[PDB]
Amino acid sequence: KTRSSRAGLQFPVGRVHRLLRKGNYSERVGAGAPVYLAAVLEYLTAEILELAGNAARDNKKTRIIPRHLQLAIRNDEELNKLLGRVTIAQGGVLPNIQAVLLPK
Amino acid sequence: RAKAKTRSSRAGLQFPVGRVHRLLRKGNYSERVGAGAPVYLAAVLEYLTAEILELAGNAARDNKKTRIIPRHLQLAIRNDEELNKLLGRVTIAQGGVLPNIQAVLLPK
Amino acid sequence: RKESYSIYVYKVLKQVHPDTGISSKAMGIMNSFVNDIFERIAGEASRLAHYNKRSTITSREIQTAVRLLLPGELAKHAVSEGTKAVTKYTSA
Amino acid sequence: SRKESYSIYVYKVLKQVHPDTGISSKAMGIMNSFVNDIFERIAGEASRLAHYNKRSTITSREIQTAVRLLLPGELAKHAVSEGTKAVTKYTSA
Amino acid sequence: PHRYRPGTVALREIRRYQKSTELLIRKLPFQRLVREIAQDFKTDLRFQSSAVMALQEACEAYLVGLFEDTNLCAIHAKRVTIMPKDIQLARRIRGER
Amino acid sequence: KPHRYRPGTVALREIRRYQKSTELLIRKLPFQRLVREIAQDFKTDLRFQSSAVMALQEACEAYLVGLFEDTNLCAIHAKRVTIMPKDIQLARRIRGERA
Amino acid sequence: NIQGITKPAIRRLARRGGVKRISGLIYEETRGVLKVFLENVIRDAVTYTEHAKRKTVTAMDVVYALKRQGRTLYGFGG
Amino acid sequence: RKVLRDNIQGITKPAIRRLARRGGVKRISGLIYEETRGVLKVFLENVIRDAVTYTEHAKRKTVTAMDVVYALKRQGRTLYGFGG
DNA sequence: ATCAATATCCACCTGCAGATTCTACCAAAAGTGTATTTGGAAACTGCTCCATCAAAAGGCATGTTCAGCTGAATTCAGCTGAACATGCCTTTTGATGGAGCAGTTTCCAAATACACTTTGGTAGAATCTGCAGGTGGATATTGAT
DNA sequence: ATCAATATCCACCTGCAGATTCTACCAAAAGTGTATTTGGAAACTGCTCCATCAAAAGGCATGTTCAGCTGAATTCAGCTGAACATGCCTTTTGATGGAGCAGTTTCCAAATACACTTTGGTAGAATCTGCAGGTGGATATTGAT
């Protein structure tokens, strides 16, 4: 039975291990590397997905659209940092008007 | 047994083509390396080395000195348009800056 | 024959928010996220392997890559999950 | 020990363009890093190209496309020219 | 007749377009501009419909982010109106120039 | 008399002076101990190749000089000649250092 | 074609940026920045087409050129 | 050894104004020297953070110059002149 | 429009720290001879992509009116620059202790390499959330006692 | 701030279409099992190279005084860009069909990879020799009468 199950993960450890061999990253790839890595991606997906779902139901919707992802990443401080040089397609911007720009 | 010719000579190159070939294999850029790649690369690097060197030794002569110090290198790369552009996110140790005072800041 | 991560993104979505779905554009946003991160982590680990003249990428390389690549509390939390997954995998 | 660098080949090219001009150790370091920096940018960009196109081998064609991508304007064509030149000179004899 | 004081509709437009994620450039004048630029680089080309979409997405996401930084420069000069002076300071700091 | 220079004349001198040189402007001992503190209060009981503190100081001064340049451009943009904090946080905001 | 990018379209783009008013000299400057951007990205993208010996610029090529320039884009494959 | 304490004040005010000259600056507000120190520390922090992280992965106890360079590259401030 | 004060530029020297050259070792190309791929070279599909073609709908261009923003002009408190005295603490130099890097062996634990014996992609049915309007009631805005 | 009169949102429903989700089978990987290689971990250990110290000097930091002008605060007017009704045209979209073209196999010749058998390159002495650092007149440059 699957290596991903042995690790107790939803992300494919086997596929990731092939992606590291076919990826021209190192001559040989250890057996613990793809497991570790697949868990990290699974987690980071979860943390974005959770914050997206919160942003999704906070908007009365049950289906996560990209706008919910942009809100989820830009309102989170450390995800905005990790994905700063990144554009979310169909994401828009957070509503932000400068104070100086506001009416009397 | 025939006499050995350095690959760099065969391509008319000063830069080491055999060494560039090793550094492409042991660098893990692809599983196998074509035989024209180390040549083509060693030529390009030699070209760019030559370009930088000519503009620096020029500025070395402009400063009345016969030995290139990193100051001249920074003067060369920053005063040339494309070199500065290629080396934007790049700092030369002991490099200094191009003298550049703003117009507004000058005396009345 | 093009493969993606959308199967596993959906499992993880139904895990955290069993009540919530996801649109197709948003699913491509996710795949791309997975892929981008994957490159960052793997390249940083590959460069770690080379800098120290090692030829194999171990889970250790991937960890140091995560500490270098992931800011603050994402780092510690992410380091944990892998060491968790490596330990649980190795046990049996 | 045994620490290799490009100091031999930078100095050869220095005497070529400026036969009367020397180079300091610090400045040679700046150069050895420059050769190495470019070498990594090109090779990495070609590594990416070969991987994008599902080809396991890096030809000199990949390097040329890398050179076009990285080098700005005239530095690119002047380079591409010098490279192709050294390749045809190599394969011929 | 009734009219809205100047600047009011401006803040209204800001609050609407920040609320949405629609593409703001008309699709065909853009696509026409894309293929024109491609022609000047290579002839008889073809774009996946998703490739012009990608360029339009990347391009409005670039410009909107620039206008964010431009506005900050207009505010830094005790102004409220973005000028070409502001876009140039914005890009000269970013490193684009 | 005694002689005096019109305020602003010595700086134009100072700009011309340090733009013509390449020396490191921070004194080396205070920068070295500053590095050891930042490192010590990160991973206890470390050592440093002298060339590593050099490389740090080189990259640091290079960073700060380029920050001042970008800062001064914001001060000029505000019809001022004096660089203020207000300018630096702007310069770093656009730079992406912390937008 | 650069005038096809109408002034109101530019104006909306500024609005999403949080901009209150626009000097008339902007719209030209905007079109110049817009073009240099499309120029730099499409060139790098077209190069990725020509290396593949293809005649159809795929969305991937654009993604790669965007990454190339440090404008990485999620959502269009890779 | 001796306790290392408040060494950001070793970055003098004259040393800061010198760095400001070479950057083309004529008049320096009084508040600049604190902001400068604040930004330099955040900078040095982030680099030494990564430099040491390379030292740790190497199982080394001395921070090598190459560690500093791999760090500066990561942050984006690629440096020429040390360890290639 | 001068005329000192003072700083700068620049030519001259010359021992020396640092480059350049000379010299033995040696890691690494080079050269040959087989064992594998590998990516074209044609041969052919199914996609997608271009091309009109043809209504309608917003959407854009335009011109007029003027609200209020920007830029110029003026004024002044006070901040930050310029000088100078003062004396600290950085710099310089030269020597040592020994930590901990780094060069060598030795040798299991672990990764790799085929050989054979389920999951994920893909293209259809069976739902199903949001769209996109439509009144209808506060809401925000702006003009006038 | 209120009293009104527009024009604007914003709450609440709602039936439907375009996508979303769930279903049925199919190669392509992934996992086992077995048999080799082999990378790097452990264990000394030689030895750079780092940490520390002392002692003297003189470079430079610090703190204080003084005030020239720079930043900020104020006023005002011309004129630029917002608002807006308006008149038309370019975009949208919805196929529809035609074919150029990315994508897939099936060979194979040519190009690479291994696997071992002659210098170019590097690490040191051993010589060279730019120029750093110190002086002083020539020359500006600056600022006070």
Side-chain angles (χ1 to χ4, degrees):
Chain A
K1 75 169 148 59
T2 49
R3 253 194 300 182
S4 312
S5 69
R6 283 210 202 83
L9 302 169
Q10 296 300 280
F11 268 34
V13 167
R15 161 175 307 188
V16 162
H17 191 200
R18 155 185 63 108
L19 291 211
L20 304 163
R21 288 183 331 263
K22 312 282 270 200
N24 283 319
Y25 299 100
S26 53
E27 208 208 8
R28 46 164 63 183
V29 173
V35 197
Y36 196 91
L37 174 55
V40 180
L41 278 72
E42 162 154 46
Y43 166 36
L44 288 197
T45 309
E47 167 104 341
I48 292 171
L49 281 186
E50 173 134 50
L51 270 76
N54 282 266
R57 82 192 293 259
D58 288 339
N59 197 36
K60 301 249 228 311
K61 302 230 248 270
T62 85
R63 173 190 294 143
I64 289 178
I65 58 178
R67 172 56 163 197
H68 305 160
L69 284 154
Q70 175 84 348
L71 299 175
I73 307 184
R74 304 310 168 190
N75 280 293
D76 184 297
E77 163 162 352
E78 293 180 315
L79 287 182
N80 177 79
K81 203 290 157 291
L82 168 75
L83 305 189
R85 278 303 171 170
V86 172
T87 296
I88 274 60
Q90 272 308 304
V93 299
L94 302 184
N96 188 50
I97 302 174
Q98 298 284 304
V100 176
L101 222 51
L102 284 176
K104 169 155 185 303
Chain B
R1 153 142 294 295
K3 212 176 187 44
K5 262 171 187 290
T6 64
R7 256 190 273 201
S8 291
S9 67
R10 191 171 289 99
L13 284 181
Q14 303 297 333
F15 271 30
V17 169
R19 179 184 287 194
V20 177
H21 195 20
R22 147 167 67 97
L23 299 208
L24 282 155
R25 252 142 36 196
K26 300 204 323 188
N28 280 146
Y29 307 81
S30 68
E31 185 54 33
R32 50 166 46 195
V33 183
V39 173
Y40 197 112
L41 195 47
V44 161
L45 295 130
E46 184 180 320
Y47 172 49
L48 292 168
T49 313
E51 193 77 25
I52 275 76
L53 272 167
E54 164 88 19
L55 281 99
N58 277 5
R61 167 171 302 125
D62 289 318
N63 201 226
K64 305 186 182 179
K65 314 225 277 285
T66 89
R67 181 190 294 144
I68 289 187
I69 62 200
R71 172 54 162 169
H72 310 138
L73 278 166
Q74 163 81 11
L75 282 152
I77 317 172
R78 296 296 170 237
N79 275 311
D80 172 287
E81 177 154 326
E82 309 197 316
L83 267 197
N84 169 76
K85 203 268 168 321
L86 170 81
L87 307 186
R89 282 315 175 174
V90 152
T91 67
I92 286 92
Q94 269 319 290
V97 298
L98 298 179
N100 188 34
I101 297 184
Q102 291 279 305
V104 162
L105 298 157
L106 279 165
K108 193 69 228 59
Chain C
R1 320 308 164 294
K2 165 159 169 174
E3 52 189 12
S4 99
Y5 291 97
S6 35
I7 262 53
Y8 320 95
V9 166
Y10 201 82
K11 288 182 191 165
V12 162
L13 174 61
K14 88 169 80 172
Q15 191 155 351
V16 291
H17 291 232
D19 53 335
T20 303
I22 186 182
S23 85
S24 205
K25 295 193 180 313
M27 178 59 66
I29 307 291
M30 291 304 310
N31 283 274
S32 301
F33 169 74
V34 192
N35 289 316
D36 171 19
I37 300 303
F38 179 65
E39 293 143 4
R40 307 199 198 166
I41 307 292
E44 184 59 55
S46 185
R47 265 171 287 96
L48 268 164
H50 285 14
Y51 299 164
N52 303 284
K53 303 202 164 172
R54 306 318 145 108
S55 72
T56 182
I57 275 174
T58 87
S59 58
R60 170 160 188 241
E61 273 66 27
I62 296 201
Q63 195 189 92
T64 317
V66 166
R67 291 193 180 286
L68 285 182
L69 260 162
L70 282 181
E73 218 71 24
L74 269 308
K76 322 239 158 161
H77 259 95
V79 184
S80 165
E81 289 303 299
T83 39
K84 170 179 309 155
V86 176
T87 295
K88 180 181 283 120
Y89 174 98
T90 40
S91 79
Chain D
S1 315
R2 177 73 202 173
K3 308 226 177 153
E4 74 192 12
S5 70
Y6 299 101
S7 320
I8 261 57
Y9 320 92
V10 159
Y11 200 82
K12 297 181 173 185
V13 167
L14 167 70
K15 296 290 100 161
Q16 264 188 351
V17 296
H18 289 313
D20 52 59
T21 281
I23 192 171
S24 89
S25 289
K26 285 210 202 300
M28 182 69 75
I30 320 286
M31 288 305 303
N32 272 273
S33 324
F34 168 64
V35 182
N36 279 310
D37 185 26
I38 305 301
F39 172 57
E40 167 62 348
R41 304 194 201 178
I42 306 267
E45 185 70 52
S47 191
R48 260 168 275 140
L49 263 172
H51 195 265
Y52 302 160
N53 288 291
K54 309 211 156 190
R55 311 200 304 107
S56 58
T57 182
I58 287 188
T59 69
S60 89
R61 172 168 200 254
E62 266 77 44
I63 291 201
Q64 169 172 320
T65 313
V67 179
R68 286 192 197 293
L69 284 171
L70 287 50
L71 296 196
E74 268 265 351
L75 262 174
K77 28 176 160 283
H78 273 189
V80 181
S81 155
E82 270 253 11
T84 39
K85 174 187 148 333
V87 167
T88 73
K89 252 210 58 161
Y90 177 86
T91 82
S92 288
Chain E
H2 186 283
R3 294 185 64 197
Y4 283 105
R5 214 158 163 93
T8 297
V9 182
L11 292 128
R12 190 141 89 242
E13 294 186 2
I14 276 177
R15 253 134 65 185
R16 155 177 23 191
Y17 289 139
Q18 292 191 328
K19 191 162 302 175
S20 78
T21 59
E22 44 173 1
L23 294 173
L24 306 188
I25 301 196
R26 301 299 162 241
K27 183 174 318 296
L28 194 61
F30 188 79
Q31 171 161 211
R32 188 181 312 113
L33 172 65
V34 171
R35 301 169 174 287
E36 148 163 0
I37 306 274
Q39 268 294 330
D40 280 320
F41 278 101
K42 260 268 282 166
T43 39
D44 197 48
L45 278 175
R46 285 169 253 219
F47 290 92
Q48 311 198 329
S49 69
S50 74
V52 187
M53 269 325 110
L55 292 157
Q56 210 180 12
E57 292 289 341
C59 196
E60 298 192 21
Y62 169 83
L63 280 181
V64 164
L66 182 40
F67 280 119
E68 296 186 343
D69 285 352
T70 299
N71 207 43
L72 295 173
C73 309
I75 313 292
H76 186 76
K78 275 166 191 165
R79 289 190 282 101
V80 171
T81 299
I82 49 158
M83 297 163 194
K85 302 154 40 186
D86 293 311
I87 292 177
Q88 279 141 12
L89 171 65
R91 283 171 85 258
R92 204 168 169 207
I93 299 293
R94 287 184 171 196
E96 307 179 358
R97 143 64 194 82
Chain F
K1 254 43 182 297
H3 205 219
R4 192 151 205 113
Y5 287 51
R6 172 90 275 308
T9 294
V10 311
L12 298 172
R13 193 133 75 238
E14 288 190 354
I15 311 201
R16 303 178 222 284
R17 165 172 177 189
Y18 294 118
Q19 284 194 336
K20 191 184 324 172
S21 52
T22 45
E23 57 194 336
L24 285 159
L25 312 184
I26 295 183
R27 302 151 325 135
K28 166 50 41 177
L29 212 59
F31 186 78
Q32 172 164 55
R33 78 178 47 124
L34 162 59
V35 168
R36 277 162 189 297
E37 147 175 342
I38 311 271
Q40 175 188 280
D41 283 355
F42 256 44
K43 203 281 167 59
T44 55
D45 202 335
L46 279 183
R47 313 179 97 98
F48 278 101
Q49 320 203 294
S50 46
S51 54
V53 193
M54 278 325 108
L56 283 161
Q57 203 197 15
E58 285 290 2
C60 277
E61 306 200 11
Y63 166 78
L64 285 182
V65 179
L67 183 39
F68 284 135
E69 273 163 22
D70 285 350
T71 301
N72 199 94
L73 279 175
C74 308
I76 305 266
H77 185 75
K79 282 159 178 182
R80 283 179 283 110
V81 165
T82 306
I83 50 155
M84 292 173 180
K86 183 199 327 151
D87 314 287
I88 300 185
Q89 311 133 291
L90 171 53
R92 304 182 72 233
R93 182 152 187 193
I94 302 188
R95 270 154 97 106
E97 265 169 277
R98 35 168 283 301
Chain G
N1 295 328
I2 193 67
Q3 302 300 340
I5 283 69
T6 69
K7 143 177 167 169
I10 293 158
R11 157 177 275 265
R12 303 187 294 264
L13 284 186
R15 283 297 147 90
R16 180 169 296 179
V19 169
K20 194 148 167 188
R21 322 102 45 86
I22 306 154
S23 147
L25 282 207
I26 281 309
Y27 305 98
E28 271 311 282
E29 287 266 306
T30 296
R31 299 193 190 95
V33 171
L34 160 48
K35 185 147 177 284
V36 180
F37 180 87
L38 278 176
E39 279 170 1
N40 293 315
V41 155
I42 291 191
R43 173 196 291 106
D44 279 7
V46 153
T47 309
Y48 279 124
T49 322
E50 210 141 357
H51 189 82
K53 301 177 185 289
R54 296 189 272 93
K55 276 203 170 297
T56 293
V57 165
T58 65
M60 268 314 248
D61 303 345
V62 175
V63 183
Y64 291 84
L66 291 182
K67 172 111 86 161
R68 199 43 196 61
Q69 316 256 350
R71 314 275 324 166
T72 77
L73 168 41
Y74 295 140
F76 283 48
Chain H
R1 209 165 48 158
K2 170 67 165 302
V3 161
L4 281 181
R5 224 164 85 251
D6 187 46
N7 288 323
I8 193 91
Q9 294 312 315
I11 273 43
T12 88
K13 143 165 139 167
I16 289 157
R17 65 162 184 67
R18 295 199 294 280
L19 288 175
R21 287 330 177 200
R22 185 181 283 182
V25 169
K26 177 173 181 178
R27 208 149 175 276
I28 303 175
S29 154
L31 303 194
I32 280 292
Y33 310 97
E34 271 307 327
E35 287 276 306
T36 297
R37 299 192 179 98
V39 160
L40 152 70
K41 183 155 177 282
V42 179
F43 180 85
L44 256 168
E45 279 170 24
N46 293 319
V47 162
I48 304 185
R49 169 173 292 112
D50 288 349
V52 166
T53 310
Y54 282 115
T55 318
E56 267 170 6
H57 185 99
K59 242 29 179 166
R60 270 185 291 92
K61 142 90 178 280
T62 301
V63 174
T64 67
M66 278 308 252
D67 295 358
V68 175
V69 194
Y70 297 137
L72 291 158
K73 174 162 279 138
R74 281 212 60 272
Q75 314 286 349
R77 324 260 318 158
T78 319
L79 184 55
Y80 286 102
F82 294 101

